C-alpha cells in the first residue's frame, strides 16, 4: 500500500526528481534552485563492513558449538535436540547433495565457478517430477557438466565417466531432460589445449592444432564423428609436421582413442593436407 | 523438391480375444521362436509378408516389420489364420497401426548446429553421444532425425498424411541450413 | 618446483614477480607413491 | 633426500585430475501350485 518515499522540489516542482546526492556533506539536493532535499544521509557501505540469499535464501539458521567454560554433556543434549527438529525441513539434501558435489569438483581441480554454475544447476532442478530417480548420481554428474558447458569449459563424457560411473545411456537421458528442464526455466575448440597440456606441447603447436581444427571443421567430409577424433587427428598430423616423436601408440594410450581412428583420419586428413598450411 | 518419404516401418496390434499355452504352441507350431527365460511371448515370423508377430499368452498380438498398411493388415490375418490353425478360438479384431517409421534424402549436407542454435526449443544435438539430430515437431507431433549426408527418418506417426506433412514442414528449414 | 594451474587447465611454470602481479599462490605440487595391497589371513 | 620430477608438468597434472583411464587396478571392486505344494 503505497509506502514509497518520492522527494520533489516543493519551490522547483517542475520535473521529476532530477538530484545530486552530496555524501561527503550527508545531504541530497536538488540541482536546480540549490534547495537540500534531504539531510542527515545514511551510508551502505558502513554497515556492510561488520560482514548467501541466492543459494539460501531468506532461511536463518546459528550453530551451536561447544563453549570456553562448558560441559560436554549440554554439547550433546543441543545438538540432539537439533538431530530431532531436522526433519521440520527438507533441506538437509541440499547440504549433503553440495558437500559431495564439493567433494567431486575438488577432486577434479575444477574452479569455483564450474562449482558454483554446477550447484546453481543442482538448485534449479532440486526435486522436481521430471526428474523421477536416478539415485542422486546422475543428477549431480550431470550438473557438473551443466555448469562446465555454461562457464565455456570442455570435459569430455569419459572424464566425468571415469570419475562418476553413471553407466552412460541414463547419464544422457537425465542429461537430456536436465536440458530441457533448463529451456523450461527461461564446441571442440576448447578441447586442444587441454589435450596439448596432456602431451606438453609447445603452444605453436597448440594454436596451430586450433586453425587446423577450425580449418577442418570448414572443410566438412566426415563432418566430426564426434569431436573428439577430430581433435586428436589434428593434433596428430600438427605433430606429425614437426619433429617432435609420439607415434600412434603413446598418443593413443595417453589420450585413449584407438589407433585405427586416429590413422582413418590421418587419411582423409593427409588428404586434405593442402590448405591447413597456416604459413 | 520433388522427393517423397519412402515407408520403412509399420508396428500394429491385433487382440485375439482368448488366451494360450506356450509349450504346446512352441511344440505344435512350424516357424516361431519361445523362451520364456528371455522373452514371455512366441516370436513368429511368415515369408510373405515378411514380417515378425509377437504373440502373447493373453492373446495380445504385435505384428511389426511391414513396409506398407495392406501388409500389415494382411499380415496380421494371417498370423490370426495361422493361431485359427493350431487349435484355439481366435478372432482377427482390434487393428490399429501404433507406429509408421519412413525415411529419405535431400541429396545435400545439412547443417546441424546452425539448426540446433535456431530450433533450439524442438531440437536436441550432441554429436558425441549421437551424430544426428533429434528435431521434436510440434504440428504434427513427428520425430525426426537429421543426419549430415542428408538422411532423414521419420518416426512417431499413426498415419501416412503426418509424415507427409511433417516432410514438407521440415524441407525448407533443411534447405536453409544447406552447404553445397 | 613452482607451478600454476589456471582456470581454463593449463599449468606452467611460475615465478615470484607473475606470482606478485596476479595475486596467485607460489607454491609446488606435492605427489606420493601410494600403495594398496589386498590380504585374503 | 626427496627427488624432484622434472617432466613437463601436463603429463603429472594430467594423472592427477580426470585422465579417462579407469580400472586398471582391481582393489575394493567386490509354476504349478499343487506340485509347489
Ligand atoms: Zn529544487
Known amino acids: 500500500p503505497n509506502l514509497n518515499i518520492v522527494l520533489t522540489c516543493p519551490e522547483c516542482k517542475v520535473y521529476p526528481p532530477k538530484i545530486v546526492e552530496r555524501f561527503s556533506e550527508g545531504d541530497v539536493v536538488c540541482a536546480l534552485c540549490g534547495l537540500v532535499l534531504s539531510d542527515k544521509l545514511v551510508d551502505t557501505r558502513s554497515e556492510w563492513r561488520t560482514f548467501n540469499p541466492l543459494l539460501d535464501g531468506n532461511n536463518l539458521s546459528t550453530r551451536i558449538g561447544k563453549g570456553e567454560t562448558t560441559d560436554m554433556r549440554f554439547t550433546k543434549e543441543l545438538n540432539k535436540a537439533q538431530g530431532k527438529n531436522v526433519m521440520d525441513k527438507k533441506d538437509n539434501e541440499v547440504q549433503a547433495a553440495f558437500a559431495k558435489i564439493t567433494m567431486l569438483c575438488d577432486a577434479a581441480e575444477l574452479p569455483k565457478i564450474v562449482k558454483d554454475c554446477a550447484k546453481e544447476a543442482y538448485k534449479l532442478c532440486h526435486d522436481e517430477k521430471t526428474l523421477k530417480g536416478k539415485s542422486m548420481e546422475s543428477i549431480m554428474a550431470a550438473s557438473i557438466l551443466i555448469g562446465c558447458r555454461r562457464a565455456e569449459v570442455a570435459r569430455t563424457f569419459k572424464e566425468i565417466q571415469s570419475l562418476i560411473h553413471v553407466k552412460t545411456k541414463e547419464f544422457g537421458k537425465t542429461l537430456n531432460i536436465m536440458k530441457n528442464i533448463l529451456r523450461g526455466k527461461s564446441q571442440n575448440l576448447t578441447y586442444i589445449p587441454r589435450f596439448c597440456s596432456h602431451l606438453g606441447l609447445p603452444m605453436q603447436v597448440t594454436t596451430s592444432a586450433e586453425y587446423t581444427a577450425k ?5 566438412k567430409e566426415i563432418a566430426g564423428k564426434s569431436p573428439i577424433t577430430i581433435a586428436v587427428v589434428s593434433i596428430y598430423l600438427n605433430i606429425l609436421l ?4 609420439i607415434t600412434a601408440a603413446k598418443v593413443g594410450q595417453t589420450l585413449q582413442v584407438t589407433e585405427g581412428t586416429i590413422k582413418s583420419g590421418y587419411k582423409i586428413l593427409y588428404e586434405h593436407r593442402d590448405k591447413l598450411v597456416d604459413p | 523438391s520433388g522427393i517423397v518419404p519412402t515407408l520403412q516401418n509399420i508396428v500394429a496390434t491385433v487382440t485375439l480375444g482368448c ?15 519361445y523362451n520364456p527365460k528371455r522373452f ?8 510373405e509378408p515378411k514380417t515378425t508377430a509377437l504373440i502373447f499368452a493373453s492373446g495380445k498380438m504385435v505384428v511389426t516389420g511391414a513396409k506398407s498398411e495392406d501388409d500389415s493388415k494382411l499380415a496380421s490375418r494371417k498370423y490370426a489364420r495361422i493361431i485359427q490353425k493350431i487349435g484355439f478360438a481366435a478372432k482377427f479384431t482390434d487393428f490399429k497401426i501404433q507406429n509408421i517409421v519412413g525415411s529419405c534424402d535431400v541429396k545435400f549436407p545439412i547443417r546441424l548446429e546452425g539448426l540446433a ?7 536436441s544435438y550432441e554429436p558425441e553421444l549421437f551424430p544426428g539430430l533429434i528435431y521434436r515437431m510440434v504440428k504434427p507431433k513427428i520425430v525426426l532425425l537429421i543426419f549430415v549426408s542428408g538422411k532423414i527418418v521419420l518416426t512417431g506417426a499413426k498415419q501416412r ?7 514438407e514442414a521440415i524441407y525448407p528449414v533443411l534447405s536453409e541450413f544447406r552447404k553445397m | 618446483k613452482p607451478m600454476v594451474n589456471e582456470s581454463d587447465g593449463v599449468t606452467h611454470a611460475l615465478y615470484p614477480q607473475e606470482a606478485r602481479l596476479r595475486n596467485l599462490t607460489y607454491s609446488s605440487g606435492l605427489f606420493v607413491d601410494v600403495k594398496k595391497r589386498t590380504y585374503e589371513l | 633426500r626427496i627427488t624432484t620430477l622434472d617432466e613437463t608438468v601436463g603429463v603429472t597434472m594430467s594423472h592427477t585430475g580426470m585422465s579417462m583411464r579407469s580400472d586398471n587396478s582391481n582393489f575394493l571392486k567386490v509354476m504349478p501350485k499343487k506340485e509347489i505344494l
Open chain 1, 242 to 245: 614437426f619433429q617432435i616423436p
Open chain 2, 117 to 123: 542454435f535456431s530450433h533450439g526449443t524442438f531440437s
Open chain 2, 40 to 47: 514371455a511371448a512366441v516370436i513368429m515370423r511368415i515369408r
Open chain 1, 215 to 219: 580449418k577442418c571443421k570448414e572443410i
Open chain 2, 161 to 167: 498424411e503426418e509424415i507427409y506433412q511433417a516432410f
Open chain 2, 19 to 33: 488366451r494360450l499355452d506356450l509349450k504346446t504352441v512352441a511344440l505344435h507350431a512350424r516357424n516361431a521362436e
